[PDB]
Amino acid sequence: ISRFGVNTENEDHLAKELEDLNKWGLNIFNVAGYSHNRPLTCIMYAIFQERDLLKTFRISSDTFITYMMTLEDHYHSDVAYHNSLHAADVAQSTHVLLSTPALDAVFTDLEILAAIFAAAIHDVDHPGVSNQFLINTNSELALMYNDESVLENHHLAVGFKLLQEEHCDIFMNLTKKQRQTLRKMVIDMVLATDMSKHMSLLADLKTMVETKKVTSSGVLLLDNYTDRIQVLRNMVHCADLSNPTKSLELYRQWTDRIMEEFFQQGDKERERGMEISPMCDKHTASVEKSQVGFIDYIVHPLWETWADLVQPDAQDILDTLEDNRNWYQAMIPQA
Amino acid sequence: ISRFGVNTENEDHLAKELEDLNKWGLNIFNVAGYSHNRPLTCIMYAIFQERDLLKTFRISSDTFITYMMTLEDHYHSDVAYHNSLHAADVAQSTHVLLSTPALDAVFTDLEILAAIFAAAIHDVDHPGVSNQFLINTNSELALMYNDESVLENHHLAVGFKLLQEEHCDIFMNLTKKQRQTLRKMVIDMVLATDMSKHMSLLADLKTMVETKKVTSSGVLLLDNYTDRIQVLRNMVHCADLSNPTKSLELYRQWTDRIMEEFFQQGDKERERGMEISPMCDKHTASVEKSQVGFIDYIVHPLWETWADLVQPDAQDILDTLEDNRNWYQAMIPQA
Numbered sequence: 001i002s003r004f005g006v007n008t009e010n011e012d013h014l015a016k017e018l019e020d021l022n023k024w025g026l027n028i029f030n031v032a033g034y035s036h037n038r039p040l041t042c043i044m045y046a047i048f049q050e051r052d053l054l055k056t057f058r059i060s061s062d063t064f065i066t067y068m069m070t071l072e073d074h075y076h077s078d079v080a081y082h083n084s085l086h087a088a089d090v091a092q093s094t095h096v097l098l099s100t101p102a103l104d105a106v107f108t109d110l111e112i113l114a115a116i117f118a119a120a121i122h123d124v125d126h127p128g129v130s131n132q133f134l135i136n137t138n139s140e141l142a143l144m145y146n147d148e149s150v151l152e153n154h155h156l157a158v159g160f161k162l163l164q165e166e167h168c169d170i171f172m173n174l175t176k177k178q179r180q181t182l183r184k185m186v187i188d189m190v191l192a193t194d195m196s197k198h199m200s201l202l203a204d205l206k207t208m209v210e211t212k213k214v215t216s217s218g219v220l221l222l223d224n225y226t227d228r229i230q231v232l233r234n235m236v237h238c239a240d241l242s243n244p245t246k247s248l249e250l251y252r253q254w255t256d257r258i259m260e261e262f263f264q265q266g267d268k269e270r271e272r273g274m275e276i277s278p279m280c281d282k283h284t285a286s287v288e289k290s291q292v293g294f295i296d297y298i299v300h301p302l303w304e305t306w307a308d309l310v311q312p313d314a315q316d317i318l319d320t321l322e323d324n325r326n327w328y329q330a331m332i333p334q335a
Numbered sequence: 336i337s338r339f340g341v342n343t344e345n346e347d348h349l350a351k352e353l354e355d356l357n358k359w360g361l362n363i364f365n366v367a368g369y370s371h372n373r374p375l376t377c378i379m380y381a382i383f384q385e386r387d388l389l390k391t392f393r394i395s396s397d398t399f400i401t402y403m404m405t406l407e408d409h410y411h412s413d414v415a416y417h418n419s420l421h422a423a424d425v426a427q428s429t430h431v432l433l434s435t436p437a438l439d440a441v442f443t444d445l446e447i448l449a450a451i452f453a454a455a456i457h458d459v460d461h462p463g464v465s466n467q468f469l470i471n472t473n474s475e476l477a478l479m480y481n482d483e484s485v486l487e488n489h490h491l492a493v494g495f496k497l498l499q500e501e502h503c504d505i506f507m508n509l510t511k512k513q514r515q516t517l518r519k520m521v522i523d524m525v526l527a528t529d530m531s532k533h534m535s536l537l538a539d540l541k542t543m544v545e546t547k548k549v550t551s552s553g554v555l556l557l558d559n560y561t562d563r564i565q566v567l568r569n570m571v572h573c574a575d576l577s578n579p580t581k582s583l584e585l586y587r588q589w590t591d592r593i594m595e596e597f598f599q600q601g602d603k604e605r606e607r608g609m610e611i612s613p614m615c616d617k618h619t620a621s622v623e624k625s626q627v628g629f630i631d632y633i634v635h636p637l638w639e640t641w642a643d644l645v646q647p648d649a650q651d652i653l654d655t656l657e658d659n660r661n662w663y664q665a666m667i668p669q670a
């Protein structure tokens with residue numbers, strides 16, 4: 001497939017954007033625009049072809065496209081941030097991190113497959129409100145999942161349930177053992193995207209970086225499965241939290257979206273007579289301070305630790321983040 | 336494919352609804368609900384299988400599904416009436432009319448194919464405002480199409496442009512002559528759905544019914560192409576205008592939608608400082624009178640003429656319409 005729409009110009013524009021597939025600087029908003037709002041289907045198709053994954057795992061192009069279209073359709077286009085463009089971005093970002101020189105030759109094909117698939121599914125069917133909002137409102141999801149990683153268990157359930165239909169089972173030609181290993185890794189990775197787990201994940205990451213063993217050639221030695229899945233879980237987490245490390249033009253567009261989503265949750269809370277979550281309150285919360293806080297307290301400590309792990313691969317990422325942090329700060333009228 | 340979602344219950348519920356595929360009483364709202372809002376893809380897949388059209392025309396199931404999913408995606412889900420559920424309904428309704436006993440054996444397989452395809456595409460990419468609104472606002476579409484059947488030319492262009500990509504070309508295995516004949520019929524049928532053409536279409540239909548020649552067995556004799564495409568163009572037109580002939584429960588739901596769409600156009604007109612189209616004015620227009628008027632002045636004269644053409648096939652349709660007309664009237668508080 002070369003296009004999803006009726007615009008012949010878009011075919012070329014789309015292929016033009018995709019020349020940047022292996023780059024941090026890819027523009028996913030453009031990909032969406034030139035793909036008839038199919039950024040997740042298209043970027044996933046591009047990534048799998050780039051990595052020869054349909055050949056390696058004997059996945060039918062036809063089945064792939066059907067599954068991806070339907071997965072993308074289970075992201076809510078009326079949710080401002082947690083929609084398929086976010087999934088696309090996190091998948092493309094994971095694609096780039098997987099190729100970082102320090103991890104060259106470290107991961108198996110099944111692990112690469114797992115990580116990109118996890119990214120693609122990691123927010124599917126997100127309703128655009130937080131775990132705590134679901135718990136506090138006694139939602140069906142919170143009752144199903146006993147208040148524990150409610151959204152993240154749901155995203156996994158949907159992504160895996162969609163594979164049950166023959167015409168969508170992209171893993172059909174994996175062996176039983178392969179499927180079982182993939183399922184374990186994806187579950188691990190997606191559950192690790194719950195922000196309630198971030199502090200512990202980072203702590204354990206800092207710990208691994210403390211005693212990392214960089215081989216002669218400059219490649220991290222990650223010998224056993226436990227060490228490999230820990231890097232992978234942190235990678236998908238970094239990709240998930242990569243917006244502030246992108247070009248400022250891209251980051252600003254992500255901010256518009258996450259604020260729209262937060263403030264809509266706040267409106268729901270007001271509507272229901274609930275206590276307003278402070279970061280969700282449009283009447284009082286500063287957009288600029290929210291990003292300075294987010295970077296200082298969450299994104300910078302994570303990315304600094306990641307950079308430290310893969311040095312010097314992530315240096316330009318760190319500088320961009322630090323540059324972007326400074327832009328938001330300078331946008332706060334007070335010193 | 337047996338489902339488009341993650342609900343296993345839906346598989347059975349969906350197949351249950353589809354037992355009514357060949358019936359006027361099918362409930363398309365239910366089909367949409369049990370198909371993860373894929374009523375057009377599912378009903379089209381059901382219809383083609385019912386009629387053995389994928390076999391007859393050597394259409395790949397895979398290609399069919401991809402094309403239908405993408406066509407359905409080009410209906411706007413935020414347009415209240417002119418969305419894919421309407422297309423689904425008009426396609427299922429055309430499916431039923433094609434089997435009316437009076438037309439038994441009359442149409443070729445290519446003609447049946449044409450008519451169902453025309454129904455499926457006939458409103459694709461509709462923006463939810465009328466031709467006259469597009470003309471009056473100097474819209475891009477009106478400038479492209481020189482103010483003539485603006486929407487209807489657009490629906491055709493999109494439906495045919497989507498077939499250009501190999502992975503979506505459901506007509507690939509038709510012969511060049513077949514493709515050319517199909518294209519001519521579909522263009523004719525879709526252009527005939529422009530309401531500005533209704534009076535002339537009806538007049539010419541009444542004319543054909545005047546001198547119809549019902550053969551011994553009770554089947555209409557329609558010897559040449561010109562007579563066949565005229566019945567087909569009127570059939571798709573009838574299907575398009577079939578809401579008031581459905582069960583009252585279904586008709587009422589259609590009314591909610593068309594009024595939402597009309598009144599939103601009126602709001603746009605107000606917003607732009609344009610003259611409000613009277614049937615679009617939410618502040619003054621009566622929903623109930625609008626349906627009584629529509630039936631009395633447009634739907635009943637058409638369906639009466641159709642019934643007359645296929646008698647006695649459409650008698651229950653006429654009675655339902657007449658019953659529904661009486662319900663709306665009785666809902667007008669004044670005599």
Ligand SMILES: COc1cccc(Nc2c(C(N)=O)cnc3ccc(S(C)(=O)=O)cc23)c1
Nearest residue numbers: 193195240241243244254255258290291294
């Ligand atoms: C991983 O799960 C989530 C959920 C909500 C936002 C985010 N990311 C934030 C973004 C972003 N552009 O990614 C921007 N600003 C934020 C501000 C606060 C938070 S939070 C709710 O404190 O985790 C989060 C964010 C991540």
Ligand SMILES: COc1cccc(Nc2c(C(N)=O)cnc3ccc(S(C)(=O)=O)cc23)c1
Nearest residue numbers: 528530575576578579589590593625626629
């Ligand atoms: C064929 O193109 C159109 C365009 C808009 C409405 C309709 N159908 C009407 C419906 C319906 N349920 O189908 C209901 N009420 C109507 C009232 C008026 C008109 S109109 C604009 O006068 O053609 C039309 C309708 C058909």
Ligand SMILES: [As]
Nearest residue numbers: 042043045046
């Ligand atoms: As693509």
Ligand SMILES: [As]
Nearest residue numbers: 070165167168
């Ligand atoms: As499927």
Ligand SMILES: [As]
Nearest residue numbers: 262277279280
């Ligand atoms: As909040």
Ligand SMILES: [As]
Nearest residue numbers: 377378380381
């Ligand atoms: As179906």
Ligand SMILES: [As]
Nearest residue numbers: 405500502503
């Ligand atoms: As296509």
Ligand SMILES: [As]
Nearest residue numbers: 597612614615
């Ligand atoms: As109007």
Ligand SMILES: [Mg+2]
Nearest residue numbers: 122123151193
């Ligand atoms: Mg998430």
Ligand SMILES: [Mg+2]
Nearest residue numbers: 457458486528
């Ligand atoms: Mg129309």
Ligand SMILES: [Zn+2]
Nearest residue numbers: 086122123240
């Ligand atoms: Zn996410």
Ligand SMILES: [Zn+2]
Nearest residue numbers: 421457458575
């Ligand atoms: Zn229509």
